[PDB]
A paper describes a structure:
GMP synthetase (EC 6.3.5.2) is a glutamine amidotransferase that catalyzes the final step of de novo GMP biosynthesis, whereby it converts xanthosine 5′-monophosphate (XMP) to guanosine 5′-monophosphate (GMP). GMPS is made up of two domains, one being a glutaminase (GATase) domain that catalyzes the hydrolysis of the amino acid glutamine to glutamate and ammonia. The generated ammonia is used by the ATP pyrophosphatase (ATPPase) domain to catalyze the amination of XMP to form the end product, GMP. Functional GMPS dimers associate through the dimerization domain.
Here, we present novel findings that add further insight into the functioning of this enzyme with a structure of a variant in which not only the catalytic Cys89 was mutated, but also Cys113, which was earlier shown to form a disulfide bridge with Cys377 in the PfGMPS_C89A/Gln complex. The crystal structure of this mutant solved by molecular replacement was determined to a 2.8 Å resolution. The GATase domain of the double mutant (PfGMPS_C89A_C113A) is rotated by ~170° and translated ~1.5 Å compared to the native structure and when holding the ATPPase domain fixed. If compared with the structure of the single mutant, the GATase domain is rotated by ~120° and translated ~4 Å, again when holding the ATPPase domain fixed. The electron density of this double mutant revealed a crystal structure that is not only more collapsed than the wild-type and single mutant enzymes described earlier but also significantly less structured, resulting in bad geometry, as can be observed from the Ramachandran parameters. Destructuring is particularly important in the ATPPase domain, and to our surprise, the observed structure of this double mutant is a monomeric enzyme. The monomeric nature of the double mutant in solution was confirmed by Small Angle X-ray Scattering studies, as opposed to the solution dimers observed earlier for the PfGMPSwt and PfGMPS_C89A enzymes and confirmed herein. By all means, besides presenting an enzyme with a partly destroyed substrate binding pocket in the ATPPase domain, in PfGMPS_C89A_C113A, the interactions that are critical for ensuring correct ammonia channeling from the GATase domain to the ATPPase domain are modified. Hence, mutation of Cys113 to an alanine precludes the enzyme from resting in a conformation in which ammonia is in the correct position for attacking the AMP-XMP intermediate, as observed earlier in the 85° rotated enzyme.
Author numbering: 6 to 233, 238 to 341, 344 to 389, 397 to 486, 496 to 520, 539 to 554
Amino acid sequence: YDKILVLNFGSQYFHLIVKRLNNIKIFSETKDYGVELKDIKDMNIKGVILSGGPYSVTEAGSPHLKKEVFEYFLEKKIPIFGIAYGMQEIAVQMNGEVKKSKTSEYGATDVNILRNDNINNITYCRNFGDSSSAMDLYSNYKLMNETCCLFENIKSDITTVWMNHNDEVTKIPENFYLVSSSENCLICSIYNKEYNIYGVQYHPEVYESLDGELMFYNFAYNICKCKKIRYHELELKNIEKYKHDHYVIAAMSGGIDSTVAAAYTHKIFKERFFGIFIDNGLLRKNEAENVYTFLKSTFPDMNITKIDASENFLSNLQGVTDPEQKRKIIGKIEEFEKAVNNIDIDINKTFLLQGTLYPDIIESKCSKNLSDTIKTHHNLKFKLFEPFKYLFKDDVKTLSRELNLPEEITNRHPFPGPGLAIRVIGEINKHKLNILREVDDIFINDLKQYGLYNQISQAFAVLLSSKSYDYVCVLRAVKTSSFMTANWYQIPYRILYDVSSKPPATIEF
């Protein structure tokens, strides 16, 4: 049977967490924080938690996990979860800055920071530095846009959680993300999506508090499907499809998710699917003349003639920015029902693929995003293939897996679905970027060979030419696992990087 364990740092309360992880019939027991690797390498553990309290980070000798073991754990693709001091130090292994909080956090106090949408709400935001406008937090630090897969099926934004810590965590780690920000302690959690490194300064503990409790249930089960694993395979050998009434179909935008989903749908046979939208020079400019060749050639007998956009017209449309009509185009994923199918395959009986992930279809199922859009049209009007729900973002970046796919395609960063219709305002033309011959790919080309993809995750272009008030184009980069975090990174210290406080500019301002 499966098992979740503890690497305990300072747990005067750990039988409650064994009570938790075991309320859910999953196996849990105690081990020292200096427990041998050779022991834990044999067994079916896909979760490890850390527990601690008000132990000082300033004076070493306080509990600590070594490197080779950190590498060991990050390589096996097992997610990491720390509680207060455990997360205090998951932020030190990966970064590290904990100064002195004259105040404490004790007992159960209301914590209410959970989304990328928090200005006037917070009352304690003026607890330091005379913050007349609470966009400062949103600027210097940012949360995972994708609302709440954490705390699934509930959103009580008031989490009144047990704590007892005099010292406070003061800084954000890499792949910056911030799940909570309390009253006295305006930082209360930090979680990275792809590595799924959770960290929470609040201690659930005794039974008078709720929300905190179910977190461990959906924790155990949603980080890892233990008792019932199915991480690939299941819904694939699951396609009747009678006669030539229908075969599989693929939606594309240049996707790792679908670089191998191709194969999942393929089954060879000369072929059985078709591609949809994206020869766009916008997407990998070199692969516009070479996009459909490579999409035919990574697996040789593949096929390619997706009806596809190439860039974005200028003032054919609005010569201004209308928040409704700026970007609202999918631009290129279904979009058309008529002759998207090159054979008069049956109207609805024909199947479909999409590169939509459980973390990517969840923007869809949930609240439609304010700032950022990847790939819309996401069942209905077609045929339910249900491949979404299979695995996550890092899981499908690794979906290249044993397919041992070319690494220069993984060094290139993903592309959503709008193009430079997102955050490019109004008219424009040829003397302007339409084949994405600026920002993004620039970075990409020296992200591969100078050595920056290892640390930096993504980058894009933002052009602004509605009048000539002014017509600029401004650069910036993002270090994101989840779908939003774009803070200032130290590239070895009139295009602009990050002179502004991050907002009032966004990933796509």
